[PDB]
Amino acid sequence: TIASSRLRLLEYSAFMEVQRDPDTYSKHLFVHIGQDPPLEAVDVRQIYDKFPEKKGGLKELYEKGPPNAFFLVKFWADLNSTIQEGAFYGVSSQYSSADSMTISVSTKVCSFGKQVVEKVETEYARLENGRFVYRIHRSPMCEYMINFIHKLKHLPEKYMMNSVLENFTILQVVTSRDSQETLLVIAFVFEVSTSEHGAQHHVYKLVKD
Numbered sequence: 001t002i003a004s005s006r007l008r009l010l011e012y013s014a015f016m017e018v019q020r021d022p023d024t025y026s027k028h029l030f031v032h033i034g035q036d037p038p039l040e041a042v043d044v045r046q047i048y049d050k051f052p053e054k055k056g057g058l059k060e061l062y063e064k065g066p067p068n069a070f071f072l073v074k075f076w077a078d079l080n081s082t083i084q085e086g087a088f089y090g091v092s093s094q095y096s097s098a099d100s101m102t103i104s105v106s107t108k109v110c111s112f113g114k115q116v117v118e119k120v121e122t123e124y125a126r127l128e129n130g131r132f133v134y135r136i137h138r139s140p141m142c143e144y145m146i147n148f149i150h151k152l153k154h155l156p157e158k159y160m161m162n163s164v165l166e167n168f169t170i171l172q173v174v175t176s177r178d179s180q181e182t183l184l185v186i187a188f189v190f191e192v193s194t195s196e197h198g199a200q201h202h203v204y205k206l207v208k209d
């Protein structure tokens with residue numbers, strides 16, 4: 001469970017979809033976080049080098065606080081060609097909060113500690129069972145990401161894929177749109193899954209000392 005005092009990530013999944021015929025659709029999940037155990041900590045200074053720094057960087061974000069909003073997710077992405085591929089590469093996520101506020105989700109793709117792509121999406125709360133729910137449904141992946149996945153899929157060894165992924169990170173920062181107050185920050189780090197049970201993940205809490 002990834003949750004700060006203000007926002008809670010409910011679900012997250014990056015996937016691809018193909019239309020085998022007009023009545024058949026196939027969906028492969030690269031990564032997934034479905035719907036509270038204690039979390040193991042990771043010192044934030046160990047990841048600084050691979051995230052974007054200076055003005056608006058992760059070090060300035062952490063210093064600004066609150067620290068209860070920072071998390072690290074290690075992903076073991078399933079890049080196995082389990083379906084044949086006009087394919088849709090997308091990302092679906094969902095959050096919840098006790099307060100009604102408009103959120104802003106920014107996704108920073110980084111290569112060698114330098115921001116290459118950024119995507120900003122404002123999300124409005126929807127009242128549901130006494131809580132506020134934010135839904136991002138089938139947000140298409142940018143061609144940078146689709147091409148990156150194709151390039152990784154073309155490497156002959158999984159160790160080669162993991163070496164490229166050593167200098168690739170995605171930083172997700174959710175802020176209250178109007179106040180600009182940090183609600184949730186999730187640093188995503190990746191490896192290619194070698195498991196027979198597919199995509200795996202591990203959550204950690206980002207700490208300083």
Ligand SMILES: NC[C@@]1(c2ccccc2)Cc2c(ccc(Cl)c2-c2ccccc2C(N)=O)O1
Pocket residue numbers: 042046047048049050074075076162165166167168169189190191
């Ligand atoms: N293959 C190693 C790893 C990994 C391993 C398994 C699953 C996902 C990723 C660790 C890792 C990356 C990429 C970027 C970072 Cl920032 C990290 C990382 C994570 C925690 C602390 C320090 C660092 C670091 N700076 O290396 O790939």
Ligand SMILES: *C(=O)CCCCCCCCCCCCC
Pocket residue numbers: 014030031077091107119140141142145149152165170190
């Ligand atoms: C906008 O393009 C944000 C895209 C975030 C994609 C999540 C990455 C999931 C695919 C796993 C491939 C291996 C590591 C990128």
